[PDB]
Design a protein around this motif. Sequence first.
Motif, PDB file in Angstrom:
ATOM      1  N   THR A 162       0.927  -1.233   0.050  1.00 47.07           N
ATOM      2  CA  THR A 162      -0.012   0.014   0.066  1.00 47.07           C
ATOM      3  C   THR A 162       0.911   1.263  -0.117  1.00 47.07           C
ATOM      4  OG1 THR A 162      -1.584  -1.489   1.104  1.00 47.07           O
ATOM      5  CG2 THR A 162      -2.093   0.958   1.157  1.00 47.07           C
ATOM      6  N   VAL A 163       0.196   2.347  -0.168  1.00 46.55           N
ATOM      7  CA  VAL A 163       0.860   3.743  -0.380  1.00 46.55           C
ATOM      8  C   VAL A 163       1.563   4.108   1.301  1.00 46.55           C
ATOM      9  CG1 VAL A 163      -1.090   5.228   0.425  1.00 46.55           C
ATOM     10  CG2 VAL A 163       0.666   5.993  -1.232  1.00 46.55           C
ATOM     11  N   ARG A 164       1.124   3.308   2.121  1.00 49.06           N
ATOM     12  CA  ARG A 164       1.968   3.517   3.619  1.00 49.06           C
ATOM     13  C   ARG A 164       3.438   2.831   3.500  1.00 49.06           C
ATOM     14  NH1 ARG A 164      -0.793   2.347   9.374  1.00 49.06           N
ATOM     15  NH2 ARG A 164       0.843   2.500  10.630  1.00 49.06           N
ATOM     16  N   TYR A 165       3.427   1.594   2.805  1.00 50.58           N
ATOM     17  CA  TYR A 165       4.524   0.959   2.931  1.00 50.58           C
ATOM     18  C   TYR A 165       5.163   0.571   1.735  1.00 50.58           C
ATOM     19  CZ  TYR A 165       2.682  -0.155   7.798  1.00 50.58           C
ATOM     20  OH  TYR A 165       2.140  -0.245   8.964  1.00 50.58           O
ATOM     21  N   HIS A 166       4.878   1.218   0.854  1.00 49.31           N
ATOM     22  CA  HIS A 166       5.818   1.054  -0.725  1.00 49.31           C
ATOM     23  C   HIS A 166       6.905   1.698  -0.909  1.00 49.31           C
ATOM     24  CE1 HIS A 166       4.835   4.983  -2.733  1.00 49.31           C
ATOM     25  NE2 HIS A 166       4.049   5.201  -1.587  1.00 49.31           N
ATOM     26  N   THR A 167       7.360   2.322   0.064  1.00 48.46           N
ATOM     27  CA  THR A 167       8.917   2.722   0.340  1.00 48.46           C
ATOM     28  C   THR A 167       9.714   1.847   0.837  1.00 48.46           C
ATOM     29  OG1 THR A 167       8.179   4.127   2.113  1.00 48.46           O
ATOM     30  CG2 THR A 167       8.509   5.417   0.051  1.00 48.46           C
ATOM     31  N   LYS A 168       9.103   0.881   1.332  1.00 44.90           N
ATOM     32  CA  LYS A 168       9.668  -0.167   2.324  1.00 44.90           C
ATOM     33  C   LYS A 168       9.728  -1.525   1.517  1.00 44.90           C
ATOM     34  CE  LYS A 168       7.603  -1.885   6.020  1.00 44.90           C
ATOM     35  NZ  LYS A 168       7.109  -1.972   7.579  1.00 44.90           N
ATOM     36  N   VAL A 169      10.782  -2.443   1.477  1.00 43.80           N
ATOM     37  CA  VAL A 169      10.850  -3.715   1.030  1.00 43.80           C
ATOM     38  C   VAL A 169      11.196  -4.649   2.067  1.00 43.80           C
ATOM     39  CG1 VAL A 169      12.773  -5.036  -0.236  1.00 43.80           C
ATOM     40  CG2 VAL A 169      11.892  -2.687  -1.090  1.00 43.80           C
TER      41      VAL A 169
END
Lengths: 187, 147, 105
Positions: free
Chosen positions: C62-69
């Motif tokens: 989601t747009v909350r976690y899409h910077t995280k892998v």
Amino acid sequence: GVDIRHNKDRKVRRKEPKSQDIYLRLLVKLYRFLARRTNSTFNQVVLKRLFMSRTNRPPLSLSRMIRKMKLPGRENKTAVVVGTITDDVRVQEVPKLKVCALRVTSRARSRILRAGGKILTFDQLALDSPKGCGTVLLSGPRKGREVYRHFGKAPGTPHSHTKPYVRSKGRKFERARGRRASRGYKN
Amino acid sequence: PSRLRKTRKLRGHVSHGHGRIGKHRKHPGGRGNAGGLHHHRINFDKYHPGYFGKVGMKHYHLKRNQSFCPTVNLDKLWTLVSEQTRVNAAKNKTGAAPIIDVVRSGYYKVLGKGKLPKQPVIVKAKFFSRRAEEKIKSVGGACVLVA
Amino acid sequence: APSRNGMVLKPHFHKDWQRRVATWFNQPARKIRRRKARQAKARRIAPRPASGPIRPIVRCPTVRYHTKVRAGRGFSLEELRVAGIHKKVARTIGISVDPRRRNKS
RNA sequence: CUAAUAGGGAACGUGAGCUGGGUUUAGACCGUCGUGAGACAGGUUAGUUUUACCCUACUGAUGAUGUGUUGUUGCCAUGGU
RNA sequence: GAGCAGAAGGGCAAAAGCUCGCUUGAUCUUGAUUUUCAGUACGAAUACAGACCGUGAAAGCGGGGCCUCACGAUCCUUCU
RNA sequence: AAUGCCUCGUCAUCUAAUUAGUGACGCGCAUGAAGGAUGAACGAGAUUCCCACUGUCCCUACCUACUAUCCAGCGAAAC
RNA sequence: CCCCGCGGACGCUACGCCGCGACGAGUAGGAGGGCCGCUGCGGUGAGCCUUGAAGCCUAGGGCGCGGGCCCGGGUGGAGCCGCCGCAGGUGCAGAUCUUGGUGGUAGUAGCAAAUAUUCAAACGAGAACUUUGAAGGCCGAAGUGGAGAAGGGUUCCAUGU
RNA sequence: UGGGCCACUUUUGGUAAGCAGAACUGGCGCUGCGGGAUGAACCGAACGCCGGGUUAAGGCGCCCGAUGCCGACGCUCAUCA
RNA sequence: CGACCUGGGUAUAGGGGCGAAAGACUAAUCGAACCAUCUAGUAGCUGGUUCCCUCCGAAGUUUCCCUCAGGAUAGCUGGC
RNA sequence: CGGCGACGUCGGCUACCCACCCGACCCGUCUUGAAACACGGACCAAGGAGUCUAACACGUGCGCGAGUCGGGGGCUCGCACGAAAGCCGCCGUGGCGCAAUGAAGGUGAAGGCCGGCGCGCUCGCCGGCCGAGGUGGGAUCCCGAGGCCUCUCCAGUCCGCCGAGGGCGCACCACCGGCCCGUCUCGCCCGCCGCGCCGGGGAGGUGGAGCACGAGCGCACGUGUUAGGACCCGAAAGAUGG
RNA sequence: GGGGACCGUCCCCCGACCGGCGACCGGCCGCCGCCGGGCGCAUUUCCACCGCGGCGGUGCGCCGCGACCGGCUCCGGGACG
RNA sequence: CAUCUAAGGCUAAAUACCGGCACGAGACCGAUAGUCAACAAGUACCGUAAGGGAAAGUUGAAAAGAACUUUGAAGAGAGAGUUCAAGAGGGCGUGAAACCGUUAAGAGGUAAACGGGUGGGGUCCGCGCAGUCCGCCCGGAGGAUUCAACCCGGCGGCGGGUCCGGCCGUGUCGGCGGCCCGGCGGAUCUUUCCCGC
Ligand SMILES: [K+]
Ligand SMILES: [K+]
Ligand SMILES: [K+]
Ligand SMILES: [K+]
Ligand SMILES: [K+]
Ligand SMILES: [K+]
Ligand SMILES: [K+]
Ligand SMILES: [K+]
Ligand SMILES: [K+]
Ligand SMILES: [K+]
Ligand SMILES: [K+]
Ligand SMILES: [K+]
Ligand SMILES: [K+]
Ligand SMILES: [K+]
Ligand SMILES: [K+]
Ligand SMILES: [K+]
Ligand SMILES: [K+]
Ligand SMILES: [K+]
Ligand SMILES: [K+]
Ligand SMILES: [K+]
Ligand SMILES: [K+]
Ligand SMILES: [K+]
Ligand SMILES: [K+]
Ligand SMILES: [K+]
Ligand SMILES: [K+]
Ligand SMILES: [Mg+2]
Ligand SMILES: [Mg+2]
Ligand SMILES: [Mg+2]
Ligand SMILES: [Mg+2]
Ligand SMILES: [Mg+2]
Ligand SMILES: [Mg+2]
Ligand SMILES: [Mg+2]
Ligand SMILES: [Mg+2]
Ligand SMILES: [Mg+2]
Ligand SMILES: [Mg+2]
Ligand SMILES: [Mg+2]
Ligand SMILES: [Mg+2]
Ligand SMILES: [Mg+2]
Ligand SMILES: [Mg+2]
Ligand SMILES: [Mg+2]
Ligand SMILES: [Mg+2]
Ligand SMILES: [Mg+2]
Ligand SMILES: [Mg+2]
Ligand SMILES: [Mg+2]
Ligand SMILES: [Mg+2]
Ligand SMILES: [Mg+2]
Ligand SMILES: [Mg+2]
Ligand SMILES: [Mg+2]
Ligand SMILES: [Mg+2]
Ligand SMILES: [Mg+2]
Ligand SMILES: [Mg+2]
Ligand SMILES: [Mg+2]
Ligand SMILES: [Mg+2]
Ligand SMILES: [Mg+2]
Ligand SMILES: [Mg+2]
Ligand SMILES: [Mg+2]
Ligand SMILES: [Mg+2]
Ligand SMILES: [Mg+2]
Ligand SMILES: [Mg+2]
Ligand SMILES: [Mg+2]
Ligand SMILES: [Mg+2]
Ligand SMILES: [Mg+2]
Ligand SMILES: [Mg+2]
Ligand SMILES: [Mg+2]
Ligand SMILES: [Mg+2]
Ligand SMILES: [Mg+2]
Ligand SMILES: [Mg+2]
Ligand SMILES: [Mg+2]
Ligand SMILES: [Mg+2]
Ligand SMILES: [Mg+2]
Ligand SMILES: [Mg+2]
Ligand SMILES: [Mg+2]
Ligand SMILES: [Mg+2]
Ligand SMILES: [Mg+2]
Ligand SMILES: [Mg+2]
Ligand SMILES: [Mg+2]
Ligand SMILES: [Mg+2]
Ligand SMILES: [Mg+2]
Ligand SMILES: [Mg+2]
Ligand SMILES: [Mg+2]
Ligand SMILES: [Mg+2]
Ligand SMILES: [Mg+2]
Ligand SMILES: [Mg+2]
Ligand SMILES: [Mg+2]
Ligand SMILES: [Mg+2]
Ligand SMILES: [Mg+2]
Ligand SMILES: [Mg+2]
Ligand SMILES: [Mg+2]
């Protein structure tokens, strides 16, 4: 029989710290002697602040201390706070400060010392200024607490801007009748 | 500790602090939030205005992640990088400005409360407020958007 | 009854909760038991990695976690094809494979 | 009939004194009222009246204190009348 | 000593009454205040301010009835 | 009238005397026709009178049995 | 510039000690202090104890405003307590309270439905009641007689206590 | 806590009420003590444990502390004072 | 001598049975048996509510309430 | 200063019994009012009633502090204690706090002074500085004329105390401004890869649980309210299955 | 991806100046004190006994008395204006 | 446009566990408590039945559990004996209160009981019974070293330009010193010497 009222005979005030901190009790002993054996009203104020509760000894941010130290005529004076000094990450330039505090945050302590400042405890302040000469007695914001938003007139009264106690904040939580004219009344 | 409570002091006192006349009875006035519009109306109106009634549009299947947009103010902006970064930029002779990626630090929107130190900086964010953009350009910086 | 200012509270204790209460006095024993099973499993697969198969690199949805892998269930069949690994051999050599994951980018 | 057949009180004296005719449970009939269940200072009929051996009061019955024991004969305070 | 719609009280004379003429301030708005009062709400009312108007030569007066009564939350519905 | 308040209705009879009974009258508070009105036999049904009978009473007395009473043994309860 | 004297009370658990002044009713209720009390846990008392613990009894000696506590004597026979903290299923006169025990009542009410017992003897420590004999009565065959069903379950029968 | 009650005075209903309802202050409730024999409310006065002195209201024949003053001036005889 | 009395065997079971009818009877229980459970049902109502000393110390009034033996609210109280 | 002291006396207000004087009705409870002809209580022993969980609120104590918190998990001979304690840090995911406002689309908290200019048009482009304004109070602190001293004076050498006035002003309070979001009224400008039924800006009122150099988080304790058997005991009932 | 450079904290050292030897310690001195052993062997010092001794403190085994001083109080004489 | 492919099937682990088998432990209870049940307890007992359902632990180390004599018909006693103790004698550790018997003392016509104040009597307590101790000095009569001062040794307290070190706190420089011959970090710069496009 005499005609007096006894409901105000016992004045409600701290005559000692309710804390059992032996280090606080030691410097209460030091400043109990200084207040008694000197005419300095500074020692009297410091002694009674030492009795005070934590809510009555609010933390003093670094920004607020700097701003009060920057006022005219306060150069080369010791900033005295009976409480905790707190780092403020909103400031970028820390000047040289002579500081006495009950307690200093590690980050605030590093910033003051790195800027050439000096930090004293209250035992060292007694040796430096036994009467408190050349000092600026500061205090943190006493009403800078969340409880004071809820204090005052009741929220459901006209011209009252006091925060109500709500488990959640949202359109469904206490925003209808009594809050808008469409829903009965607003006041 | 039960030894510190009023019960230890109310032994020998017949009513246990609840009073002889009114007594202590099961549920006088109702259970829970009973009678909030009837015999408890004054308390609900005095201390909980807005409690009764509907306001606004409902929305089925709300997904809190879609609305996720943490904000940071300009006064806290320089705390997202190291102290080495900001002293190096200040003493830098050129016009080289450091890049602050607030998305990397966990923020999406940059708000404009406070003031910035007088040095240029490149700020990367998903969203900018109007005043945050104005203040960043006032110190000679730039705002660049990311997705 | 309401008494002065306070928060309107709605406890969910109207449903005979005391007959369904989960205590956690076996939590220390449960942590011990899983740790014995972890140690026993590691000994059983003596040279093989204790944690298990290698898992793929995966971006959170989601747009909350899409910077995280994070780690995913298994490598995609497209990933295995261009890596030159048969989808039936990979599970025998510690490669987790997820047949139902596609690679949009 | 009589001299006269005065009026009253005592937890409207007196039910571990009685009686139970009346009122005032449950059965039932009539009249009136009510759609009805049912109601009626309306009428009528049938309808369990429990315990004292305790304390006191009272009635009678032994005794008790003082004249050393014991007996005979007596007096009269007081109470009733 | 009449009248002013009505109960009563107050008020009122080139008035607030009667008769004419022109009208729609009985309109669109935000707050403040008074009354009941917990100084909560409703209702009613007072003084303003911003529009758009009416009347009069004009000063002005008017956002209903000379004043004290004539009225109604949440939920739902309906209209704008 | 087991149905009428007024009501102890009015008249007659029954008695020395009758808010009782019976007979009669009827603008009947509020009688009445599948229930009205009668009518023998019957009734541990309600009521009135008469003969006989009697301790129901005047007005109480005496006697008998078992108790109560006293004794040996045994031995509660209510409150 | 102490010195023929080399000396000079107590104190200040500072959560302590000392001084002065005013004041003192109290249900419902609130608060503080408790070196008041009960049970158990962590520390501590080089604690106590068969040369006698707990408990209990006591015309014994005292302490505290009080909650209570210490000591003597007796009984008892194996454990127990002080202090610093910790934790409660922690304090009773009542609730027609629960369970158990005990009084007055009181040697009292009572052992009065169906006519009735008496004499002698035996056994026996012991006889109104047992057994035998004698007499007087009762049930009076729709029985107080003789046998069954149901139900009981050894109550049947001897001997003994 | 949200049953109140009482007294002076003002005061409404009622024949009146130890009735019902208001105003004001005080009191009882929550309060003991001296006095009114006795008594929630009257009069005096409010309270830690005591010694001495003095009073308040009320008393001083005897019960029962105090007139056992050579107290003052009058009034009054009651066979329900 | 009868719609007579009675044994045993059967049938009808709880909002059901059975009743020549009294709300009678249905195991000393009947205008809804008994047993266990839901269940420690709810109670604005009655009763009780356990050591000491010290300090402070009330109210039976306001407003609203299917409110009038109860609450909310303000007042009076205590503590910090 | 006196008297008296061992088999008879001396002291012991406590404690045992008795006598006398004065005072004294039986407690608990409801109640305006109880000794009540108001209820419970014959007696004794033992038992016997505000507890625990959760959630809030405020106060207090402790740690850290714009952060705080590992509680779930994992690592440590796997275990007397130890089911404890210790550790993790790319285990801080997450919770709460650090930003509010609007139904929502959304938007989202810095001003003050000095200058040249359009026209310093209630105003637009910049410069320079300082970094949350101001008024009135405001503990404390600072300066301070003048005083207080010695066996005495002409003349200052060092600091201490009192001190009229003056200054900087903490926290906090009252007030006036300012800033953010909603909504009205008025009005003129600006921006462009989308020239748009596009986007932005201003002034004046008003609605907000806001800003205006953070105070929170975790743990503990107390009190109060509430849901739970909920201080303890108590119905007439209702339901299910026998 | 490494490896480097730089920056911030460190590290043990080579060295000097700075404040002090501190409550971080030793050696030397100086003063003082104590202890042990000698000497000092008596007008010194110390120990125990006696006096019905004196001065101080505490307190008399029991029961009593007196005196003066001070505080509070109730009274009584005398005199002056 | 995205996403999956129903109306057929199987599958371990992580999870649950007031019944069962076998264990371990506890800031729990301690015989009216803790399970109803510490014991021949779901027993005795109750109900036609469904079902309801208790009370009840303790001699002593060891029975050494009282031989024997004597009264009585016996129960029960008196002696004797065992035991450390039967003032532990088979429902027997301790053995409270209520209540009762007896003995002793005191008292008694206003029911008892109680508060205050005394008095009398009594049981006890007080090593009660010729009533303190101890500091200095004076006097008398006796002992003992050794009193002071000096010498030696030991140990302490205080002071000393650091007299000498070892220091420590703060800075001060060459950094000799570490990414080989010391670390840990940095959202600081780089091959313009090196491994994948
Ligand atoms: K105050
Ligand atoms: K209370
Ligand atoms: K006579
Ligand atoms: K209004
Ligand atoms: K006009
Ligand atoms: K509408
Ligand atoms: K017929
Ligand atoms: K008949
Ligand atoms: K211990
Ligand atoms: K005590
Ligand atoms: K003992
Ligand atoms: K209140
Ligand atoms: K209230
Ligand atoms: K038959
Ligand atoms: K039924
Ligand atoms: K009423
Ligand atoms: K009673
Ligand atoms: K954890
Ligand atoms: K966080
Ligand atoms: K939002
Ligand atoms: K509760
Ligand atoms: K059953
Ligand atoms: K049991
Ligand atoms: K059992
Ligand atoms: K024994
Ligand atoms: Mg006083
Ligand atoms: Mg008071
Ligand atoms: Mg009380
Ligand atoms: Mg009680
Ligand atoms: Mg009560
Ligand atoms: Mg009568
Ligand atoms: Mg009778
Ligand atoms: Mg009678
Ligand atoms: Mg009758
Ligand atoms: Mg009847
Ligand atoms: Mg009809
Ligand atoms: Mg008739
Ligand atoms: Mg009959
Ligand atoms: Mg008799
Ligand atoms: Mg006579
Ligand atoms: Mg206008
Ligand atoms: Mg007739
Ligand atoms: Mg007759
Ligand atoms: Mg017909
Ligand atoms: Mg008091
Ligand atoms: Mg308890
Ligand atoms: Mg009891
Ligand atoms: Mg008898
Ligand atoms: Mg008899
Ligand atoms: Mg015969
Ligand atoms: Mg027969
Ligand atoms: Mg036989
Ligand atoms: Mg009440
Ligand atoms: Mg009232
Ligand atoms: Mg009245
Ligand atoms: Mg009344
Ligand atoms: Mg009361
Ligand atoms: Mg009072
Ligand atoms: Mg009084
Ligand atoms: Mg009196
Ligand atoms: Mg009188
Ligand atoms: Mg006196
Ligand atoms: Mg008198
Ligand atoms: Mg006299
Ligand atoms: Mg209960
Ligand atoms: Mg119940
Ligand atoms: Mg209503
Ligand atoms: Mg009541
Ligand atoms: Mg009561
Ligand atoms: Mg009454
Ligand atoms: Mg009473
Ligand atoms: Mg009475
Ligand atoms: Mg009652
Ligand atoms: Mg009882
Ligand atoms: Mg009774
Ligand atoms: Mg008890
Ligand atoms: Mg752990
Ligand atoms: Mg996060
Ligand atoms: Mg200010
Ligand atoms: Mg303002
Ligand atoms: Mg609260
Ligand atoms: Mg129902
Ligand atoms: Mg048991
Ligand atoms: Mg026992
Ligand atoms: Mg026998
Ligand atoms: Mg023994
Ligand atoms: Mg025994
Ligand atoms: Mg005796």
